[PDB]
Amino acid sequence: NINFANFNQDFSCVSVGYSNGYKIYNCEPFGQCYSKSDGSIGIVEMLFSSSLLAIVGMGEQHSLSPRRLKIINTKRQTTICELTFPGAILAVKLNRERLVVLLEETIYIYDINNMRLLHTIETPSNPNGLIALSPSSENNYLAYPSPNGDVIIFDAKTLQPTSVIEAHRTSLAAIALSKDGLLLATASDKGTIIRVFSVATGIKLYQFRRGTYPTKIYSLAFSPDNRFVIASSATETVHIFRLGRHFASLKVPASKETKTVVGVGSKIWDDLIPDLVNKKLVHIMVITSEGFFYKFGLDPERGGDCVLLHQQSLF
Numbered sequence: 269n270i271n272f273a274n275f276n277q278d279f280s281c282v283s284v285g286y287s288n289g290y291k292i293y294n295c296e297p298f299g300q301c302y303s304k305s306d307g308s309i310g311i312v313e314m315l316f317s318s319s320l321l322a323i324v325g326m327g328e329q330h331s332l333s334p335r336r337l338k339i340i341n342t343k344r345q346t347t348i349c350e351l352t353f354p355g356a357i358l359a360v361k362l363n364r365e366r367l368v369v370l371l372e373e374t375i376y377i378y379d380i381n382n383m384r385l386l387h388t389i390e391t392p393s394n395p396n397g398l399i400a401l402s403p404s405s406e407n408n409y410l411a412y413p414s415p416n417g418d419v420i421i422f423d424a425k426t427l428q429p430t431s432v433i434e435a436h437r438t439s440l441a442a443i444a445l446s447k448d449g450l451l452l453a454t455a456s457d458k459g460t461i462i463r464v465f466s467v468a469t470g471i472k473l474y475q476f477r478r479g480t481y482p483t484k485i486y487s488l489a490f491s492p493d494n495r496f497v498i499a500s501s502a503t504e505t506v507h508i509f510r511l512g513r514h515f516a517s518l519k520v521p522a523s524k525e526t527k528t529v530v531g532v533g534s535k536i537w538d539d540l541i542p543d544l545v546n547k548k549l550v551h552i553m554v555i556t557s558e559g560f561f562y563k564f565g566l567d568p569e570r571g572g573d574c575v576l577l578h579q580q581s582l583f
Contacts, residue, residue, distance in 0.1 A: 270286055270557075271308065271553045272310055272311050273331075275449070275486075276315070276363070277314070277405070277531070278296055278447065279295065279489075279534065279553070280317060280538060282553075283320055283321070284582050290303075290306060291304070296551070306341075307329045307330070307332040308327055308329065309326060310326030311324035311325075311357065315362045319340065319341070319342040320340075321342060323338045323358045324357045334356045335357065336352050337353070338350050343401075348383075352370060355371045356532055357370070357371070361399060361401035362572070363402065363424075364380070365408060365424075365425070366410075367380040370399045371382055373394070373488065374390055375391060375399070375412065377424060387402075389422070391414065392414055392415050394413060398441075398442070400414045401445070402448075402449030403449070407448060411452060415439055416436065417435045417439055418432055418433065419435045429504050430468075431467075431470045436458075440456055442486065446490040446494050447490065447494075448494070450466065450468070453465075453490065453497050457484070460483075461476070461479060462475070462478070462485075462507075462509065485505050486502070487500045487530045494511060495512075495568065500530045502525045502560070503524065504526060506530060508552070510571070515568075516574060517572075518564045518573060522558070528555060531552070532550065533551035536550055541565065549565035549568060549577075550568050552564045552565075559581055559583050560582075561579070562580075563576075563580070564577060565577045
């Protein structure tokens with residue numbers, strides 16, 4: 269049984285948490301590149317393509333717990349550190365300088381090279397575990413909700429609040445940061461409107477109408493060049509909004525209300541698609557809660573309905 273899946277910071281790998289261990293997958297080309305038998309893994313987060321993994325257990329076990337974080341080395345097959353907490357760990361986020369741990373009403377920031385607690389934030393209840401951490405060390409921003417749908421921008425370098433963005437009038441359902449930390453994508457629990465902000469200034473740059481009827485937005489993601497922001501919801505249609513809407517879309521081949529996380533590759537590929545043609549395509553990958561891995565090809569020039577390139581699975 270599959271418990272957890274997520275991309276790494278540059279969307280070149282996928283870390284998966286199972287009831288009997290955890291695995292690492294490459295995306296291009298897709299294939300298992302690491303596996304480890306263990307207890308039920310509830311969370312397993314990567315640090316790009318390094319051998320550093322952040323691991324939290326699902327359910328109380330002997331050496332695993334939903335209240336405990338283990339930092340390990342896959343190469344040396346060693347545990348580097350272990351942290352305990354007074355509550356369930358909702359989310360763990362990482363960059364090459366900071367490690368962030370999310371609990372329902374508290375946020376813990378660590379210097380990732382010595383694992384020393386740097387700052388602690390008392391927050392309003394964050395049950396959905398919404399948080400985002402910039403993969404950029406040059407602009408190390410931290411984003412979390414603070415109920416309406418306000419977003420606090422916290423400098424993870426200087427350990428200081430920066431700005432307060434009034435994203436939505438209602439509670440946030442989804443949040444994302446660009447690879448450079450410069451852009452912020454948000455979505456409320458209404459899910460009709462997708463907003464894009466500039467972190468440093470607080471200016472709402474774009475605003476895309478997802479649809480007319482409300483829905484649950486699961487996942488927002490930027491392309492690495494910040495050309496596109498994509499969104500997946502309960503309707504299983506994934507929108508691709510061009511930053512410069514209706515540019516493109518695709519249909520996740522799954523039943524309604526199937527939870528997904530989306531991600532965009534960093535390279536453009538010369539794929540051979542149908543009597544045959546080659547097309548320079550942006551790869552958009554979709555992970556479903558049932559463990560399916562769908563790779564769609566996005567034409568970054570004409571857009572339109574993205575073609576399915578490959579179906580892969582985990583468990």
